[model samples]
Target: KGPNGLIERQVTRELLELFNIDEQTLNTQGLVVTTTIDPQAQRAAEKAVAKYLDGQDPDMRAAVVSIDPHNGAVRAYYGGDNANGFDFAQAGLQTGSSFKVFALVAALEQGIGLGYQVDSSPLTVDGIKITNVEGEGCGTCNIAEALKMSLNTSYYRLMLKLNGGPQAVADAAHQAGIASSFPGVAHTLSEDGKGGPPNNGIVLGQYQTRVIDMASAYATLAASGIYHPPHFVQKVVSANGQVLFDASTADNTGDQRIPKAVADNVTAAMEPIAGYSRGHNLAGGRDSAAKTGTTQFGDTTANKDAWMVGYTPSLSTAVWVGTVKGDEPLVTASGAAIYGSGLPSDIWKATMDGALKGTSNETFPKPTEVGGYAGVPPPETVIQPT
Candidate 1:
């Protein structure tokens, strides 16, 4: 008998497996499981998800997860209603452009600077075409501007510059806590039978990722590159008071997986998005950074997934909105447009606002060595079929 469906289903099952607690023993001997869930944050997450999905398609759903960056404690987890029969927050969906953060981090780690310039023109790599939303590149733009605009062409070019190809981007994502493989699209493959490496499409976010994973990754950035695997169970004890598990003693919790400088650099690049114009003012005036992602199912007009993952120095949160059925378009009841910066950003703003209501608005620490480009000339732009 937990407070919400998320606790009863997801958290309880995880704790049972983690502590090796038997269900039969629980029935015979009472046990206690303590979680790190903040009730107010939990309700805020739940309410935000519900508020956004209201009067939408019956099959439409949303998921939200918030975490404490310093400790990796899962502050809130809302997987939406059970109608979809899966934990949406934990289950992988097409990450869309939200996957670019990993590539951005990888670039920064390789000494790529925020002022590094890239040609945002339409490009064709290995017969696959990459273009920006505006159908033309930014002509000459820095990595910071590219990210702020969510320019697909710039990321596509940056991934190419990475030493190990798209696998480097994948490596960056994995180091930051993305456990799942990148989506297996036709463009991700090599010409020969050998699975060489991911192509330009990789940076365009041709991959599947869970909202929780994105939240955890952003939490790592929020924690200055310390990767703390998200956890729900804080402690578990038997009825007689024998401690079965404690997160504080866990080996992986609060591990420093990424360098503080690299994370801080990435945060610097993302900082502008939280301001008034770009990321649709998602941060609501707090010092924050975020990215938005949107992907179409098959055709260009029919969108299937939308996401917004953002973080302050203290907290990180992710919001996703889409139908469980991948083929369905993600339109509202009134048939209004739905983009990552629209409903998902609104939900994120409301949820974060509530979650951080009484807490002090702390700012992120500045990086000692701000990143810059390697002096490589911009690549030649080419037009390709969409």
Candidate 2:
């Protein structure tokens, strides 16, 4: 209606009625809401997931989500087995050992040097066995090797050394956006209970979390220690062509919770995990960082859950595979041999290689300690193995 109140008419309805439903007379025009979704990377991610399935039973499920690590832009989200009303993408279960990435970072923030030794020995407290996965002893290893090898005993030992011990590690994990509980369920673990500080389960990734939460945690590493809430709702539009809520140019960078040097140091250690280490082999040439995890048990036998989360300078992604009922055990090596460097790592490698192929090969910015810090001897570990 104009200011003069000249007329009130429904132009769209009038035209449609006059057309009499004929194909030629109908308008095929409508609004298409699409942001900049990378087709190449998306397709590559899907293909990678598909290849990894390799004709397994159809009941199994998998998911993959990739985002620009510089900002919090989600590029691809592939949630397999959508038809069964089971959305693995949204499932919040135990993130397992993947949470160690943040725990180790917190250790670094507490002034723990890379060469600082943490003894990986058996400890029995409150009638619980706190030791390596194999119950054998590896004595001591530096922080870097502990992470690269995904040593449970070593990480557990280091976690006890952090401020507040396991409680502090849990706090750091939460700050990184790793949730301790699912949306509608109470957390299975507690900060100060029978499963209290110095608990071995902490090293096994027994803490519950969602995939998105874990993804955000990994993204923080590539984000240089910034933390932000993960979001998918970019914008909202009104019927009158006005943007009710526009995030077209939204800034998703979170608070700088960790020092740049500390984040880079942690990332530096994680580099080998994805590159040439015994863990997952998703190192697609370009500099990358990542971690893998596996759940102890599921609701059923066919749905044991395993996860792989990683990031590069440009993007980040998390992958999960298991049964619908969540009843399968983790697929890990028996005895002391099992770690994230195996199956989960393999899947991570394949997906990362395909998604970032031919993209700009940019290395992570060297931290001050590596690039040169005042009065500090250059860390011998910074040099890549020849």
Candidate 3:
């Protein structure tokens, strides 16, 4: 018998498929598979996803994935209620504003300080108009402010400044642990005039990504730039005490994929997002940071997906809510608009509250070197359209 019932259904089933464990071998030999799932974290993830998605449409779905930042071990994995079907946690969907993290990382790595200024005015790129939420504008705001406000125009301009294309941002994302096959990701940097036009829309998270992939990528930043491939099985042993597999001995599992300083700065920039009153906040007085995302359907009136990806020093988690069928607006049980910073952030906060229960509160480490605007700068403000 293999690890049939010891682990959760999602975890066990995934491992069997991953290793191609056959029924004949399982019947002949007794094997044990130890996973890295933390019971509390797993329960928290399941409870949060269910509680938030309860009473919604039958076709509506949500997923949550939690991971240990230090190791690649998955702490909790909840695809959805339908374990027999496709794992939404691994399914690619539009990441929306969550994709901004990669662009921020790329800019920081290029020595672009958190204080690097960009115009947050509405602008058009390749016939697509980009603007701040509700056409509001942040006059001459820095990267940190733009990110916290989820300003699309600011990132669009930043993407252009980074080699005048989305390639650098794409490269930064791949290095930060995003899957190579993530939909709409540019394979190579677009050369000026060589490619018809740079896919600048990427900065707005027009591409699709899996919840687990986003969690793993954010975990890298939480781990101070170290990239650890998310893994399920910790070890496997036979009935005769023979060790079949050990995750510790696995080769090339962890690496310093991003510079510590770059990651630290990026994390620092996200601090404001964590404190945003509208959403993406953490509970239990724990120090954390995160980003929120919302992708609309063909028209701006209908929303297709909402996402919240965040991390504390000890754990990283991603929450996503959307529909599998035709374009549908995401809403709460009471029919409130479900923006990324709204319902998704609420779920993320509740899950983190449970996951971090009893754990000592910790603060993020300050960056040794501060780049961008080091000194006192002008007062920054955004004037919303009245």
Candidate 4:
């Protein structure tokens, strides 16, 4: 593996496991494998990471991934230095506020409208006390306002009030393409569906999730609720040119995970973040939506990990910046503290801007209102799990 081989090598390992092709066989077979990687976007992703991170401590790691939302074609990937022996792209780290969207999805599917108001005061649920970034609270805030403000306690209360509880949030995320499971939590929603580990916190993204999964999940929203399993290999041919696998001929029509109206409302809720990072609105003034995430060091307000995940109608990208060791805090080489709105936001802007150059100016669908107030509709909107 060499400089340009980071994505290639990672795909190679993944392809082997996927196709059950061994390393020896691949070396001897003279096989032809075409991946979905786009050269321009890949270069942009690489440059985005290095532009801000090269001067930082070597222990500071970053990962970037961009995907074609409709088909799961991964266009760009950057998983840190080749010699580092670990791919940060696949590393599961706490998602912080970026994880809130799934809870928003769960709420929307339950017929909860963006206007559903909640109390964001610091409180304890299941004995776990929750607070906002600066301990500020809102007595009454709607879902959209809570999301724009990234209020932690609001989502915690919202998820708990759901019939499916936080496990439903987990289920919603899994449906949207979060491939990994909660490391220490049970996979099943509890009986009565009222309980789940860190019940109050999962909506705030207490569990760790991989960067690529985040990209894929956001792409689900980008595609208006379609779930296209994230893929790498586009085609594979034998030594003599017989095609073994061809993605174009495959069933690329994705599964509908979140309802179209639900996804639209979720995007509408997060659209403001495009202006927050000053990136989602691309070069052509293309519309986009996004969310920022930052996990604090356990005992201090110092950041542990930071992320910015967003999407235009055609593309979704996730960028994560943090320490290699979980113990290290997120600080720049110059000793400045970094949050989700800091380096990750800058890198996301760079990657997205570079990747979207000359691309179409696609727009997202308008948001639709839903239920949960005095005039709220019944839960007919909730899509039944097949």
Candidate 5:
């Protein structure tokens, strides 16, 4: 019997029907769906998520995904309990701080300098207090630091600075190939949640999405800002090992959805987030560009949905932890802070480090237009008073 027994058998039957396989052929010649999933990374992600589950009680739900940023390949995916019970592969969870990466990319596309100051002061939107995660005001910081720290207040401010406000961020998200909805996938927010009217929370990944969506979204950025539709069945082999189907390389040569230059700039800004002290402390000295996220817990006063989305030059991943049986309460003391950086970050580091162990450490490509930030500013000696 398969792992899930009856359910696995039913799923196998459904798969056969979905693919129009003949029962005679199925009995004689087994079909092989050649997936693009990298065996190494997929195995690592599964192990990493399982490690976390070992600590939790029976009911805790978790999801993890790893994508090859260069080709939009879903290398690894693991969702807790039963993959059949709740489709974490397609489950739409609150993106949380992981959404900030999109906002940051939008800000960069708008000519906002990486060194430009972003106001992080508290503000109110329709009677709701919009403030930083910590509630302590952050006056100004560069985009690099803002992203490294996953500063929600700064991201919110950057969103307001956009021309059409949150809509501008949403537009950028669309351009990056992120979808607002998935038809067959039932998500928590899409079920009953209406995102905030203005929806500025895109900066925090508030809108819900499937893990597949996250994989595609990050793949777009990693592919120098080009997005292509992802497919699980890269190739299909017939009973006699004859090729029935095959996937072709995506054509990203024509209209550049996002300029390679712009992608380079964004990646440059993300460098400190991956390589600096802030990053070191978060992920235990791993080289990575990452963002962490958390959303409001149940309809109560405790806990929150936590997530981490990150990548190296070769791969990008998203991880989530919370509930499938509706939101269960978590442990958070009054005034204590919890976010993606807390647990998800650690998990990401472990998974990635293990998966990429033998791979070469390649540096990200630099853009011709992007310059270094370390040099002194141009001199103003001529205008100085004697």
Candidate 6:
């Protein structure tokens, strides 16, 4: 009844048949379907997209996804306005620093303490210089510090430090809820959006991933390391009023994909960032673990994508902003620079605050506070002289 049926149409096209409601059944049948989508959250998500992208470039695209981590119910989802005519909810794009969350968790799970130290100095690999977003450096920062700074080189070193290199992080993401294999691109590029092994850029989010995957992965963290596969359609009833499916009647508890300590440590590492910039966008001083990200347009200084992802005990969300065609640099309507902490964070804050309004301001569980280099030590990184 509001904007065009883009969102509804897409949702129906994708999810209506989960309970045997065939693609054509909606038009011909009278079966009833109960969805987990919250009206208030959906509207808030849509409005957040519009409020941020209303007058921006027509080719711009944005995606917002909110989920109830406890049971895997999708609370809200928005791909983009059909004004551009494509549903990117499940679409993949380069993730940027937002992907650092996986690295943090992997470190914990691998027994490498959060205090595990590595050089945050610029790194040169395969004739490429890996630097921070600000072209600065950190001197042998611990794992937690590396994540807080989102240091490209430090993370890269940590990847090298891992038992399986980049594959370790990829494995962590898979356990956490990232379904994509990233069959490969970069600053290392999944040129075709299909990422494969030797994913040196995995930590940098040079690999593309869907919004739902990000939301679901964070949902695992929020659920105390239990990964509830994101789902929709709470119940289904036949035209004769027979119940065909009901999520509530069954145990929806999900897989314990990660150790509680890893999740808790990851959450604690992100808590201080709430006020770092746009993180405080959450209302009521609620406790949450949030991270911001932005990917480059190439070897240039401009950005190609921006993202904000985080979770509370009740909800997990991921917000992405970029171009549909993604063939150019991204900017605001007034041509302002776009970073994850800027507009995307603003939208994330608004969507979360608006959707969770009137609800109790719950907090995350206490952190385990244990991290240090535990596994085989990583080799010292030696930057190649330019």
lDDT for each of the candidates?
A: 0.76, 0.61, 0.76, 0.80, 0.62, 0.78
lDDT of 5 by residue, 1-386 (tens): 21123223333454465568766656666777666666687677767777765655565566777777666666766655453455565666677666777776677677765666676666777776665552334477676667666678888888888887777776676677676556543322232444423366667666767666776676676677876655444666787898766654445342356767666666666555534423532233445555666776643445567776767778777777665564565332333434666556666766787678787776666553433342111225477466
Deviation from native of the Cα of residue 77 in model 2, angstroms: 1.4
TM-score per candidate: 0.87, 0.76, 0.86, 0.89, 0.79, 0.88
lDDT of 2 by residue, 27-73 (tens): 45332223323566667766776776667555555777776666665
Residue 155, model 2: lDDT of 81
Residue 47 accuracy (lDDT) in model 5 = 74
In terms of TM-score, which candidate is strongest?
A: 4
**Candidate 2 vs. true structure, TM-score:** 0.76
Report the error of model 4 at residue 193, Å. Answer: 18
Name the top lDDT candidate: 4
lDDT of 2: 0.61
Lowest lDDT 10-residue stretch of candidate 3:
1-10
Instruction: For model 4, name the residue pairs that clash.
Output: none
Model 5 stretches with alpha carbons more than 4 Å out: 1-30, 134-136, 184-198, 248-255, 274-286, 298-301, 332-338, 368-386
Question: In candidate 3, what are the lDDT values of residues 1-386, reduced to their tens digit?
Answer: 11213235545565566668865665467777788888898888778877777787777777788888988788887776653456677776778777888898888777788888899888876777676542346888888888878887888888888864588777888798887653344432233433333367677787667788899999999999999888888888889888878887768457999998888888877776767837446665678888888876675665678888898889999999888773677766677667788768878888888999988988887874546443213468888896
**Candidate 1, run of 10 with poorest lDDT:** 184-193
Worst 10 residues of 2 by lDDT: 1-10
Error of 1 at 107 (Å): 0.8
Alpha-carbon RMSD of each model: 7.8, 11.5, 6.4, 9.2, 6.0, 7.6
Superposition TM-score, candidate 5 onto the true structure: 0.79
C-alpha positional error of residue 12 in candidate 3 after TM-score superposition, expressed in Å: 6.2
Give lDDT for model 3: 0.76
Q: Compared to the true structure, candidate 6 yields what TM-score?
A: 0.88
